[PDB]
C-alpha cells in the first residue's frame, strides 16, 4: 500500500488486504465455510450406503 | 510605493486531483462526488514580480 493507506479493496468492493499496524506488513483476507453437502444414494430398496 | 496592477486570469488543465481515502485501489475505475477543482476553469493568477 501507500505509506498513508491502511486497508485495500478490489473491484468486488470488499476489503481483502489489511496492513499490520505493528509490522507494516500487508496481510490478505480469505474467508472459509465454502459450499454444501450432497449425498449419493444408490436406492432405498438395496443395502444402506 | 505599493503599485497595484489589475489581476489576470489563468486556466486550469486537469490538475487539482488527490486521493480521497486510505482504501488502496488498483486496476479499477470508479466514480465519486467531492469538492474538486473544475477542469478548464478561470482562476485568479497572482503575482509578486
Ligand atoms: C425391491 O426389490 C424387490 C426384489 O426385486 C422387489 O420385489 C420389490 O418390489 C422392490 N421394491 C421397490 C419399491 O423397488
Ligand atoms: C478568463 O477571464 C479573462 C478575463 O475575463 C478572459 O479574457 C478569459 O477568456 C477567461 N478564460 C476562461 C478560461 O474563461
Author numbering:
A (entry chain B): 559 to 607
B (entry chain C): 20 to 68
What does the paper behind this entry write?
The spike glycoproteins of coronaviruses are responsible for receptor binding and membrane fusion during the initial stages of virus infection. The spike proteins of most current severe acute respiratory syndrome coronavirus 2 isolates contain a D614G substitution, by comparison with the spike protein of initial isolates. Viruses that have spike proteins containing the amino acid substitution D614G are currently predominant in the severe acute respiratory syndrome coronavirus 2 (SARS-CoV-2) pandemic, and it has recently been shown that G614 viruses have higher infectivity and produce higher viral loads than D614 viruses. In this study we present high-resolution, single-particle cryo-electron microscopy structures of the G614 spike variant showing that it adopts a predominantly open conformation, unlike the D614 spike that is mostly closed.
Strikingly, the structures we solved show that the G614 spike exists predominantly in the open, receptor-binding-competent conformation, in contrast to the D614 spike; 87% of G614 spikes have either one or two erect RBDs, compared with 17% in our D614 structure [and less than 50% in the structures of D614 reported elsewhere, none of which showed two erect RBDs]. This conformation has only previously been observed for the furin-cleaved protein on exposure to ACE2 (6), including by tomography on virions. The greater conformational flexibility of the G614 spike explains how it more readily adopts the receptor-binding-competent conformation and suggests how the presently circulating strains of SARS-CoV-2 might have fitness advantage over the D614 variant and display higher infectivity.
